[PDB]
Amino acid sequence: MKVGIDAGGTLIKIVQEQDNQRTFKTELTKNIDQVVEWLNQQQIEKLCLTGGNAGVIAENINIPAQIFVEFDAASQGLGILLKEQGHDLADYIFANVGTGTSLHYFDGQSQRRVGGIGTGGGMIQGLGYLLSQITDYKQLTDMAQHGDRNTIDLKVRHIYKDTEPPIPGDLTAANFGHVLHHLDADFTPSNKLAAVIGVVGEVVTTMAITVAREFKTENIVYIGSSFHNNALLRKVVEDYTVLRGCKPYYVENGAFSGAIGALYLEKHHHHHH
Amino acid sequence: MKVGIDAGGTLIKIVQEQDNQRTFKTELTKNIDQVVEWLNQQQIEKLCLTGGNAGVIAENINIPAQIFVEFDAASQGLGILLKEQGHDLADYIFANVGTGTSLHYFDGQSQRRVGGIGTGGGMIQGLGYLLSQITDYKQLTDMAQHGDRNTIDLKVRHIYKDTEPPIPGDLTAANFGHVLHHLDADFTPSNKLAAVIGVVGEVVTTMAITVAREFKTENIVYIGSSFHNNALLRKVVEDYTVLRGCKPYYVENGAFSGAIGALYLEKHHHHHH
Ligand SMILES: Nc1ncnc2c1ncn2[C@@H]1O[C@H](COP(=O)(O)OP(=O)(O)O)[C@@H](O)[C@H]1O
Ligand SMILES: Nc1ncnc2c1ncn2[C@@H]1O[C@H](COP(=O)(O)OP(=O)(O)O)[C@@H](O)[C@H]1O
Ligand SMILES: CCCCCCCNC(=O)CCNC(=O)[C@H](O)C(C)(C)COP(=O)(O)O
Ligand SMILES: CCCCCCCNC(=O)CCNC(=O)[C@H](O)C(C)(C)COP(=O)(O)O
Ligand SMILES: [Mg+2]
Ligand SMILES: [Mg+2]
């Protein structure tokens, strides 16, 4: 039994490897003591750790651990998953939409971080809570899926009206920019939450397409737990990526890229010269 | 009396020129009929118009009008204001933070639009209203200035804790990402509004610095009415621009760039070959 753990800001992702097969597990970072409880019931010779909370797991258990930097671990695990899933890409941007969002350019050989933004899953939860009082992640995301953004967001065509606009009229001109034009609307929790997911998706995708243009790649791979149980977010991102002439990729178990990467990096750290 | 009008999504900006001197006026786009009332009391031979609502003014009054595209009008008026204010820049990004945000690269000769995002003034107002029930712009912005974002936003150092992080620990990791860690906090209107201004500023600045890097300029000029009565927004943007090694510029009357640009373009449209 080997174990890779990516202990992030909101979720701890665990990949248990037992004889040619992955078992995937998640736990809330809030419940990190329960991950330690679990580890203490296993027969594990070594922990392969990454993520901001890796140090906390390592401090709190007597199993040898090695820590890897999340950006390299994520890149490496993602490279493995892409190849397993039949994608042999020469280069790509990857956008890791976790608690927050980190953007990387992979040139075929290694990753470099090319930007980031605090619009991600943490915003969906936190701003979602302020607008709906919902704390349960499944409830929040389920509620959002069929929300109508029309009374909340302003489009370019709302500003330009009968004049042909200088950029496409369907584009969002201002997230939440229609609220003051609809002050007698019922701003339902569903509608508000859809608009939160909308702005997060639009910001992420805009940054990803911008760095794809800068680094001359048409491929953009989207990973992170923020996509889980959020088909709306996936659609916002996929649609706008395609509109801007890039190819979006989503990866089965992509949220476990870092954990897979930690196991791989540990394995290949052992060499000599 | 010559008149330039930039009739935007939220504000109509008017520049009245009378014998070597500008007079600046603003009106809400909501009140566009009151701009037409005003125009009908003046002695104006021609209107120089730009912005999404230009067509509405032109349709509703019997004074000859010529319409200019806002991106060129803004660029040209901004170039005039920069030189008047002692800035002789070889190149720059300009970020027009209006109802929404439009980003341009000026290479010394002309502008091209290099991106945009729906995070801008309209979001400040609309999301601000959803979080505070305040509709008055001065009240909203004044309330926000001294808000404390600490119980609302998550920083990198909150995730990494005792481990040295791979990027600076003071950076926002997740806008609104601390809300679920402070569910018993008093989320005051001031604090919520500061966090709205924060995310808008951070997104704008992140996009501006990214395109500054792409187009190889260190100069970033920020214009738009979204900065009016919002010293907090100005500070968020200035600080993060400087952190990322770029030089921020704010322009006196920069929000009137388009209106000034329309008057100039009209003037120089008359030539022959
Ligand atoms: N079961 C869940 N509980 C809470 N958040 C979830 C869950 N599933 C998905 N998420 C979403 O995923 C985000 C975290 O993404 P992830 O890639 O795991 O980030 P991190 O590495 O920072 O923990 C959350 O902020 C939330 O939007
Ligand atoms: N008196 C005001 N009333 C309403 N909004 C204001 C006012 N002053 C500044 N603003 C801010 O400026 C934004 C509009 O910026 P501006 O550059 O004029 O945009 P546009 O060209 O789309 O009208 C508003 O969304 C708001 O955040
Ligand atoms: C004060 C100026 C604000 C500028 C901050 C905006 C930029 N912020 C960032 O680039 C960090 C965005 N967040 C991230 O990259 C990730 O959330 C990270 C901090 C790496 C932690 O990883 P995850 O737990 O996997 O999200
Ligand atoms: C559906 C996919 C969403 C992608 C939309 C995100 C990108 N949106 C944009 O680039 C438009 C941002 N807004 C602007 O550039 C301006 O608000 C504009 C529409 C030009 C109108 O000018 P202003 O009234 O001066 O703000
Ligand atoms: Mg992570
Ligand atoms: Mg404008």
Short mmCIF file of C-alpha atoms and ligand atoms in Angstrom, two decimals, chain A residues 6-13 28-29 70 96-100 120-122 124-125 137 224-228 255, chain B residues 159, ligand 1:
data_model
loop_
_atom_site.label_atom_id
_atom_site.label_comp_id
_atom_site.label_asym_id
_atom_site.label_seq_id
_atom_site.Cartn_x
_atom_site.Cartn_y
_atom_site.Cartn_z
CA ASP A 6 -2.70 16.31 -1.93
CA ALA A 7 -3.84 18.18 1.16
CA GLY A 8 -5.28 21.37 -0.32
CA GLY A 9 -7.08 24.40 1.01
CA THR A 10 -10.53 22.78 1.02
CA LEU A 11 -10.19 19.11 0.11
CA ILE A 12 -7.69 16.43 0.86
CA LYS A 13 -7.33 14.09 -2.13
CA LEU A 28 -12.52 17.88 3.84
CA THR A 29 -9.40 19.73 4.93
CA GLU A 70 2.15 21.08 -5.71
CA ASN A 96 -6.11 24.23 -11.64
CA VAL A 97 -9.41 25.54 -10.28
CA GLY A 98 -9.15 24.64 -6.64
CA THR A 99 -9.91 26.79 -3.65
CA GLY A 100 -8.32 29.41 -5.87
CA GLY A 120 -12.31 29.58 -7.94
CA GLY A 121 -14.10 27.11 -5.77
CA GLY A 122 -13.64 29.02 -2.52
CA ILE A 124 -18.26 29.81 -5.23
CA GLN A 125 -18.71 28.53 -1.66
CA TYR A 137 -21.59 22.07 -1.19
CA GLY A 224 -9.80 20.91 -9.94
CA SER A 225 -12.47 19.84 -7.63
CA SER A 226 -14.45 23.02 -8.39
CA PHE A 227 -15.90 21.24 -11.38
CA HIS A 228 -17.30 18.37 -9.30
CA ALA A 255 -8.69 16.67 -9.33
CA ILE B 159 -3.52 27.43 3.23
N1 LIG C 1 -17.41 17.64 -1.28
C1 LIG C 1 -16.98 18.92 -1.42
N2 LIG C 1 -16.94 19.75 -0.38
C2 LIG C 1 -16.52 21.03 -0.48
N3 LIG C 1 -16.08 21.57 -1.64
C3 LIG C 1 -16.10 20.81 -2.76
C4 LIG C 1 -16.53 19.40 -2.73
N4 LIG C 1 -16.45 18.92 -3.96
C5 LIG C 1 -15.95 19.90 -4.77
N5 LIG C 1 -15.74 21.01 -4.03
C6 LIG C 1 -15.28 22.25 -4.72
O1 LIG C 1 -13.91 22.09 -4.98
C7 LIG C 1 -13.17 23.20 -4.44
C8 LIG C 1 -11.78 22.75 -3.99
O2 LIG C 1 -11.09 22.26 -5.15
P1 LIG C 1 -9.73 21.48 -5.02
O3 LIG C 1 -9.15 21.26 -6.35
O4 LIG C 1 -9.88 20.22 -4.19
O5 LIG C 1 -8.97 22.51 -4.14
P2 LIG C 1 -7.86 22.53 -2.96
O6 LIG C 1 -6.68 21.77 -3.53
O7 LIG C 1 -7.59 24.00 -2.61
O8 LIG C 1 -8.50 21.83 -1.79
C9 LIG C 1 -14.07 23.76 -3.34
O9 LIG C 1 -13.73 25.10 -3.03
C10 LIG C 1 -15.45 23.54 -3.94
O10 LIG C 1 -15.83 24.60 -4.82
#
